[PDB]
Design a protein around this ligand. Sequence first.
Ligand code: AGS
Ligand code: MG
Lengths: 148, 164
Amino acid sequence: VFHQFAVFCDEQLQNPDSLEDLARLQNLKKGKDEEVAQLKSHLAKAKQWQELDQQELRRVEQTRSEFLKLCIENYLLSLAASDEHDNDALRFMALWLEKSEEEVANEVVKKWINKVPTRKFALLMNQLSSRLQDHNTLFQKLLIDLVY
Amino acid sequence: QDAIMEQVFAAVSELLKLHRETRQRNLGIRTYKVLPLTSSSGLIEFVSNTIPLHEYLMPAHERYYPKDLKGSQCRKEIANAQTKNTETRIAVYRRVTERFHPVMRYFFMEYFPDPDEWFQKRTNYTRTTAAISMLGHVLGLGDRHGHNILLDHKTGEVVHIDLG
Ligand SMILES: Nc1ncnc2c1ncn2[C@@H]1O[C@H](COP(=O)(O)OP(=O)(O)OP(O)(O)=S)[C@@H](O)[C@H]1O
Ligand SMILES: [Mg+2]
């Protein structure tokens, strides 16, 4: 069940349709902000439409953030449950290292990382020990503890 | 633009004739002729015995459902909620389509009362709609409102114009 749900959410993240939608909304926001920067009810309507674009973009990004949370959480739960799916460690690792800045990913990982057997990560020490740094971030406090 | 795209669509529909399944069903599109004279004028072929989809649908909606909203009332209710969040837009749209029922099935019952002719013409409608739907997806065709779609009331098929 957990692998099913994690693979679903992952596929919903790397969807070409949704990525093109996010890119289109981003270019729209950028161009509308530039147009507002030109003029500074013309300004009134322009900034009203800019605000509507902002609301749409917040909605889309919140959807993507929820998908990211569910993906990481269910990968970690699936690794801790059975041995059927063990290349989920490589996929979880790629997904977590891409999002080392987004603190939502780090909160989910902090919550669920201590229940996975460390034998699932044992063969990925070339990639884990290459990202070690002393920065006092949460990502580093999780990575150093996992390597330890 | 319209003439170039009409030519492109005609060429792809000619490609459709080389395959057993689309040729067996005569899947293709109906063409017309655009002739640009200058950068500001042209001659467009008026397709013979069609009727625009909107000109049939807006009178029929009030002829068959006198208690429903008019078409202009639905248009205005949808246009007023255009600068609002998506939740309010979807709620207004559901509210409007709960008081607006389709009437297209009568186009065939009032132009073809013979069941043999009726069945053949409704099949023509469905097939030409399917072909133009796939072909216009593949080529990104847009601007598909009710004034660009004509209903041929002799053969039952749809004609798409203004393909720019
Ligand atoms: N080639 C055509 N053959 C038959 N009917 C046509 C043809 N071109 C347009 N029409 C219809 O004749 C009417 C003339 O419309 P037009 O003035 O060409 O543009 P329009 O779509 O009606 O108006 P807008 O502002 O573009 S929505 C409309 O009802 C069209 O559906
Ligand atoms: Mg037109």
